[PDB]
């Protein structure tokens with residue numbers, strides 16, 4: 204049994220600045236993944252590999268919005284579901300005792316719905332278009348994560364760290380909060396850009 208679940212939320216504006224996007228970047232956080240993990244070594248590609256079934260209807264519409272596959276065209280994304288499949292096989296495979304394909308993705312949607320990080324940041328006077336200290340961002344998120352969240356940065360331009368993703372950890376059963384390991388990817392010697 205793994206130690207915790209990490210909900211990874213992507214900030215679209217940043218993701219589409221550091222990567223090639225085929226979808227318009229939503230002005231809200233989206234799901235990048237839900238990773239069962241351990242503090243020691245990274246857990247991934249657990250056996251046996253779980254068969255992936257293509258989603259349809261409501262679940263499909265829900266995932267296309269909340270877990271938008273930014274790197275692919277909408278039609279291909281909805282039809283072939285490349286990113287959802289990859290994430291399920293690489294990470295979903297590590298929590299098959301408590302979840303199935305449907306409840307794994309359902310959980311991701313439920314956990315995402317628990318937060319409105321954009322609004323939380325705003326009430327802490329942190330909005331897109333400016334830069335802020337790592338600590339200020341961290342403190343704002345912890346007000347809702349309860350336990351330590353993981354603020355992940357990317358540097359599209361050397362020397363300009365920016366908010367790329369936010370991780371929030373939960374217990375394996377997703378009933379309680381858990382302290383996320385700190386990736387220390389943000390250069391705290393300088394402010395962090397919150398891309399508009």
Ligand SMILES: *[C@@H]1O[C@H](CO)[C@@H](O[C@@H]2O[C@H](CO)[C@@H](O[C@@H]3O[C@H](CO[C@H]4O[C@H](CO)[C@@H](O)[C@H](O)[C@@H]4O)[C@@H](O)[C@H](O)[C@@H]3O[C@@H]3OC[C@@H](O)[C@H](O)[C@H]3O)[C@H](O)[C@H]2NC(C)=O)[C@H](O)[C@H]1NC(C)=O
Pocket residue numbers: 231232313315316317318319321
């Ligand atoms: C940016 O993204 C965030 C997260 O997705 C958006 O916030 C969420 O927005 C949805 C849609 O407006 C909103 O859904 C509504 O939820 C309430 C109940 O919410 C409470 O209970 C949830 C379960 O216990 C819990 O997860 C929440 O955190 C709240 O405590 C329902 O009563 C409403 O009916 C509505 O639910 C939606 O109904 C339509 C259905 O198709 C859909 O699946 C279902 O979700 C969330 O509450 C809200 N979450 C938060 C934390 O506020 C945010 O709005 C986005 N930004 C903008 C500007 O759009």
